[PDB]
Amino acid sequence: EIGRTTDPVRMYMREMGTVELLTREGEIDIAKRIEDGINQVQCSVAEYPEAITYLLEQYDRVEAEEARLSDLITGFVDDPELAREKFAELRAQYVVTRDTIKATAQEEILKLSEVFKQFRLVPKQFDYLVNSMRVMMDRVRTQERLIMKLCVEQCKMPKKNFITLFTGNETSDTWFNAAIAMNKPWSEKLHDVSEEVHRALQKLQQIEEETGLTIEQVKDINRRMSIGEAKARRAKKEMVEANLRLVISIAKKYTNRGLQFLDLIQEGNIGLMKAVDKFEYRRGYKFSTYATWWIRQAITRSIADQARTIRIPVHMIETINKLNRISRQMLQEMGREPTPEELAERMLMPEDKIRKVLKIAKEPISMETPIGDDEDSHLGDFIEDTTLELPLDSATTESLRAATHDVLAGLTAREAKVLRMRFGIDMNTDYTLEEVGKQFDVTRERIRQIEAKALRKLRHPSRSEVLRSFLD
Amino acid sequence: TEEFDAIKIALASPDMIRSWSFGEVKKPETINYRTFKPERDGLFCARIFGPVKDYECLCGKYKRLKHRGVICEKCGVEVTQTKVRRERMGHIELASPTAHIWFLK
Amino acid sequence: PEEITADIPNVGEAALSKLDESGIVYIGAEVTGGDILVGKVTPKGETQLT
RNA sequence: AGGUA
């Protein structure tokens, strides 16, 4: 509330306090309206042919054993036999409905929507069909808005006149002549941009041909869709908002074990939405029971990821938890301490992996903590930089470079020259033996013989003594 | 070796903030725990802030002083001097705009 | 894994003198600053050479 | 943490 508050926890509780808890039958009623919405959107997809063609393409791919069976469908409302029978009769209904296009047609459409009513498909495939119908909406509205932009910005006419005249066929030359009939100045102005508008109309007709249905039915079906997902999303949001209390109660148990409570409840809300998307009452179970495991999984994932400073895999985290539980069991049984031998015995895990896991299970500590129990110095004030070359070593390197340059200057021209590129001496590049030989226009054993001659000359105790000090 | 008569302080623009940044930090990952090689693209990243050890790509591809003017295009990691890791800044693309606390309280 | 041994690469024999065959200095040996007490060695990793 | 000026 407005109480000079600066804690998101407080006003999150304010937000959750507005929505009253539900009963067991209340969840069923909300899921029932959710099911009504999803049936509406399924019927909307049903009236759309192309999504069904795509679904049948994937069914054929599955029949060809190219895709997983459990990645297309999950359960039905009264197995490969049932799926085959339903998809065969569904293809029959689809083709008998499509034949009516290229009274009777309405009956075929109704039977088609009925035979989809049995289908219960994977959320991924349903989302794909929803996205396809959504991009159908997007392309239809894009064509309409292109016609809008052309007729308005090129002919200087208000947006109000277009709606009445254009709507009703929207894909013919009738409205052109109808608008021209009043001898309006914008009607005359339309004759200089008529080509582009007609080309866009041609693209709209091509889109209709691709869909296989008249554009007016496309608008009707997509508006039915849109109201469908609107109802579905409203009901799902109502469920999520009414179930926030379960998330809060579950997460507050995990708060005493580290990690921010707010992150926990946010992850639990994510899991709650996931459960809502997957919830059904045809199972007969309570929604709270189903959502509990989802919330626990989300909370465990959050503790695994966002609570460890260094990344630790979820399976590794579970192994750590099992190790800790068995350690507690052995500690309370033996009563002394967890001995590594018994830890090895309980797991299939050797023991060196056990100790390395135990090392991993600990989280990094801040340097801002004081070393020595609240000394005014911090831990990071003592950490030596190990990535910095010591000035002693830098001076040694400089002296070695000078000595090597002097020694190479003490040799002949070609020998020193070969040595410079062979090892990359005093240039920022290194070259191979054959690379140096190519520039020395001699690609044979001769270049390596020159290198060996330089080495043998350096073997003498007059050029190696200066370099002898560097390597002890 | 650096000459400058004055220091200006001003409001940092999102465009010039991206100008400072060499890569977008997209993951909260830090390292691979057992292998202390930094993750991609985490808070520590050779793909963004530069290589950890001197003049070698953190993929095991290029380990030499020769490969210093060219970055490794065979993987995300680039190859430069390690001191560059002390100067390269990154940027995080916030989904929602966020108010600056200093300009607030 | 690190190991404790008497034989240390590239060290003077004086250091090896004060240690046993186990790499540990004898009890009662007199040592000064810089003398080696425990012959720890670490498995050397990849080496970059100028 | 304790101690020194």
Structural commentary:
The PDB classes it as transcription/dna/rna. Keywords: bacteriophage T4, RNA polymerase, transcription, inhibitor, elongation accelerator, complex, transcription/DNA/RNA, TRANSCRIPTION-DNA-RNA complex. The entry is titled "The cryo-EM map of TIC-TIEA complex". This is part of a larger assembly, with chains A (472 residues), B (105 residues) and C (50 residues). With 472 residues, chain A is mostly helical. Chain A has helices at residues 8-18, 24-47, 49-63, 80-99, 104-117, 123-155, 159-166, 174-180, 185-189, 194-211, 215-242, 244-255, 261-278, 287-306, 314-334, 340-346, 352-361, 391-410, 413-423, 433-439, 445-458, 464-468; strands at residues 73-76, 119-121. In chain A, strands 1-2 form a two-stranded antiparallel sheet. Chain A is extended. Chain B has 105 residues and is of the alpha+beta class. In chain B, 15% of the residues are buried. Chain B is built from two helices and four strands, in the order H-E-E-E-H-E. In chain B, strand 2 (31-32) and strand 3 form a beta hairpin. Chain C starts with a strand and ends in a 9-residue tail after the last strand. Chain C is 10% helix and 8% strand. Chain C has a two-stranded antiparallel ribbon with strand order 1-2. Chain C is elongated. The chains are: A mainly alpha (472), B alpha+beta (105), C little secondary structure (50). Chains A and B meet through loops of A and strand 2 of B. Chain A binds one RNA strand of 5 nucleotides through residues 370, 372-375.
